[PDB]
Amino acid sequence: DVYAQEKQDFVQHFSQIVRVLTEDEMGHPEIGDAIARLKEVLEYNAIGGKYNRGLTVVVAFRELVEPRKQDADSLQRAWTVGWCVELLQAFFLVADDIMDSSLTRRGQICWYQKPGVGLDAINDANLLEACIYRLLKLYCREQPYYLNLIELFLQSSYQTEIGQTLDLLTAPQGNVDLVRFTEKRYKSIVKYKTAFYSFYLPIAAAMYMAGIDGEKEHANAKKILLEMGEFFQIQDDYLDLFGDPSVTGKIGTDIQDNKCSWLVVQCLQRATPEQYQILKENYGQKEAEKVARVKALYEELDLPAVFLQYEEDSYSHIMALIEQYAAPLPPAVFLGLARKIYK
Amino acid sequence: DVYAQEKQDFVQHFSQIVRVLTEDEMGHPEIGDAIARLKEVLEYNAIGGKYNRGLTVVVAFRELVEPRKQDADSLQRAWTVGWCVELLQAFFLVADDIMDSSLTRRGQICWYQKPGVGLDAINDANLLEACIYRLLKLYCREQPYYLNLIELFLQSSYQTEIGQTLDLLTAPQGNVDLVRFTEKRYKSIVKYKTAFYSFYLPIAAAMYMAGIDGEKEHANAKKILLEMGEFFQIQDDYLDLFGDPSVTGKIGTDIQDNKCSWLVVQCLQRATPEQYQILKENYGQKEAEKVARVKALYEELDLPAVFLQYEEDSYSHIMALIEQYAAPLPPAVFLGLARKIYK
Ligand SMILES: O=C(O)c1ccc2cc(-c3ccc[nH]3)cc(-c3cccc4ccccc34)c2n1
Ligand SMILES: O=C(O)c1ccc2cc(-c3ccc[nH]3)cc(-c3cccc4ccccc34)c2n1
């Protein structure tokens, strides 16, 4: 697989990323200790995930550029831009983990929860963000798409931040209000907080690196990619409860943490005034008894069948979007990604 | 005064900054609530200071550009870039206030300490940072210095963050270690954390807006400006204790908060092993008795006279630096700023 194979070369390039990012320690030994801290931040937070967003950059680059044009340097730049996508995510996760008081991320203790880190992780998340632009300068400065990539990473940060704000306003900590847990609000939180950086950003970066800088081609790619992003998060919210941690590697937390999951949202539009009272009394409590009662109300309202029909209808629609908005890009850029997302 | 007069037009332009930054609410009413939160973040955190760094941009622009070239648009851009410097500072302050557990900033409650804000201020500080690049795009996109300004703001953020890391490593919360409170470390924390964004960034932005984009001219301006920055923070650490809150508007906190102040640093290089023990026992305690004992040990080691001689020697050196590195820039760009800084 285009992904599975390239995932080794991708992860092997992290060693160079770290070396280059900690290189100013030579000329400026004054800041050596801060550079040593940066290295630990990169090593803890950029490593441990699946690297799929970063990998999407490398995979789309190979499918958008003529093999003849894909020289050693072009490839080193594609892996660097892939790692910039991974550093953007690492900065948002370090910060979000602090904001929602998380304990673990991918079964490892959150960086901020580590002894001696604490709220210093706020500066660490900022440093992870600064690393993107340092890498873009170091490798893509002389490239004609340099400014396009800077603006894309900056716009993606802003859209994710707007999304994060929307999420925090929708679900205040120590506040029970299912009235604001609407579908229209859910689609908006998903579009800004996840879809842009996870789906639009990787392909968009590959597109500019290929010289595809047209506004219409980017709007066309955006139409497909955000729709894929909307499906993905809906699948993430579903598998969190109605899935299995064997295949996924994540156990149900959405209920205990009062999250604006797609499940609680569809329960809202389809409920008798009595069924709405049951949800209000249970959702948000860390007692295993109350968590068990929520899962039951979803099952009765036939939400697994509501998701199953949503997935069938979603896949069909995304195939229709690819036919309509892929050209002139090779459909395989969108298809390779859709295959990995859908089941 | 070039500052005092222009400070009214500068502050009057904040209304337009907010209007333009909250304008995407029209086409995207989905995110309206997040835009409403952004507006409150801007209004609380960008207003209330003295605006001198932002003002430096406007003042240097007028002294670097021919009056004939200073049209309505050029001026609107200079005020916008000035406000970008103020938003960069607002983002660092919101975040630093969270990290060191501050209660107030300029006598007003810290944003994060406000009811309902808490750790959400982490996303708020990020949004303040995103606003810089949104403003640069909205007003300077078509300008030839566009990329120069983006890279300058990005490099200034990174240098401040590196400085902040250096500070946090030097003074760990709940940790007494005066061994790492050296002069060489102090000058490094001041250079990266304060000097670059406070002194280099405003003039540098004015310089690029004037078409002065040469590497040597920027290195020349940097040599003067960082030296001014080093003096400024040393004066800030001195006036915090040996100053008066009537003129300054700040009362002594450095002692109670175990900060790496220039006073404690000069006390280290000039102390008998017995005088070092006294400092260790007192510095860092919130008891008014222990705070009073520190001030006494400084006075005996003739630190106000050590600062007085430092200020005399510093002003002389900065006049020598201006003679040597101002040309071809009009010396009045550096002099107007030096006058405001020195006494
Ligand atoms: O952090 C990661 O890299 C990560 C972690 C868990 C994942 C789970 C699925 C998945 C769940 C059910 C069917 N498929 C898909 C992807 C994914 C794969 C390929 C490309 C991607 C691009 C953007 C976002 C995700 C992906 C995945 N990526
Ligand atoms: O937040 C602010 O704008 C602010 C607050 C307190 C201040 C105190 C002094 C001051 C203390 C003793 C003699 N002078 C100088 C400036 C200052 C004035 C003009 C330009 C500047 C450029 C960068 C940094 C500071 C300034 C000042 N600026």
What is B133-149 written as a DSSP string?
HHHHHHHHTTSTTHHHH
Give resolution in angstroms.
Answer: 2.3
Three-class secondary structure of residue A329 per DSSP: coil
Is any ligand 1 atom within 6 A of the Cβ of residue A53? yes
Angle at A154 between CA A9 and CA A140, to 5 degrees: 45
Rounded alpha-carbon distances, angstroms, from residue B169 to A37, A90, A312? 9, 22, 53
A165 annotated to a ligand binding site: no
How close is the Cα of B236 to the center of ligand 2, in Å? 10
Quick check: A162 and B31 CB within 8 A? yes
| Alpha-helical segments (H) within A243-287 | 262-269, 273-282
Among residues B241, B193, B236, B192, which one has the least CA distance to residue B342? B236
Cα(B225)–Cα(B322) distance, integer angstroms: 10
Q: Is B91 a catalytic residue?
A: yes
Of all protein residues, the one whose alpha carbon is nearest to atom 26 of ligand 1 is A52
Work out which ligand 2 atom sits closest to the CA atom of B55: 20
> Which residue in A232, A240, A307, A334 is the catalytic one?
A232
B180 noted as active-site residue: no
Query: Could you confirm whether B254 is annotated as catalytic?
Result: no
- State how far the alpha carbon of A175 is from the alpha carbons of A36, A168, A190, A257, A261, in Å: 41, 11, 21, 11, 16
Helix axes A146-170, A201-209, angle to 10 degrees: 170
Angle between the N-to-C axes of helices B146-170 and B121-140, in degrees from 0 to 180, rounded to the nearest 10: 160
Size of the A and B interface in Cβ pairs below 8 Å: 121
Count the Cβ atoms, other than its own, within 10 Å of residue A137: 14
CA pair distance A160, A200, nearest whole angstrom: 12
Report d(CA A96, CA B185) in Å as an integer. 32
Q: Is B106 annotated as a binding residue?
A: yes
Judge whether A317 and A334 are in contact, CB under 8 Å: no
Sequence-separated (6 or more) residues with CB below 8 Å from residue A74: A61, A65, A209
A193 is catalytic: yes
Q: How far is it, in rounded angstroms, from Cα A32 to Cα A23? A: 10
- Cβ neighbour number for residue B214 with a 10 Å cutoff: 12
CA distance B81 to B209: 9
Is the CB of B130 less than 8 angstroms away from the CB of A158?
A: yes
CA R_g for chain B: 21
Q: Would the CB of A250 count as within 6 Å of ligand 1?
A: no
Cα dihedral B27→B30→B34→B37 (10° resolution): 70
Q: Solving technique for this entry?
A: X-ray
For residues B93-122, one letter each, b for 16 or more C-beta atoms within 10 angstroms of the residue's C-beta and e for the rest, the string is: bbbbbbbeebeebeeeebbbbeeebbbbbb
Domains of chain B by residue range: 1-343
* Distance separating alpha carbons of residues B272 and A80, to the nearest angstrom: 53
DSSP 8-state secondary structure symbol assigned to residue B180: G
Distance CA A324, CA A326 (A): 6
Ligand 1 mutation target, pool A237, A340, A343, most atoms within 8 A of CB: A340
* Contact (CB, 8 A) for A185 and A260: yes
| Angle ∠(A105,A107,A109) on CA atoms, nearest 5 | 65
The stretches of A47-194 forming alpha helices (DSSP H) are 52-64, 72-99, 121-140, 146-170, 183-190
Chain A positions in Cβ-Cβ contact with residue B126 (cut-off 8 Å): 95, 157, 161, 164
Bridge partner residues of B108 (DSSP): B105
Superfamily, domain A1-343: Farnesyl Diphosphate Synthase (1.10.600.10)
Q: Phi and psi dihedrals of A331, rounded to 5?
A: -50, -30
Paired with B109 in beta bridges are B104
- DSSP strand E in chain B: where? 104-105, 108-109
A261: Cβ below 6 Å to ligand 1? no
Active site residue A223: no
The answer to whether the peptide bond before residue A202 is cis (omega within 30 degrees of 0) is: no
Flag whether B100 is marked binding.
yes
Residue B15 and residue B42 in contact, taking contact as beta carbons nearer than 8 Å: no
Residue A53 CA to ligand 1 center (angstroms) comes to 8
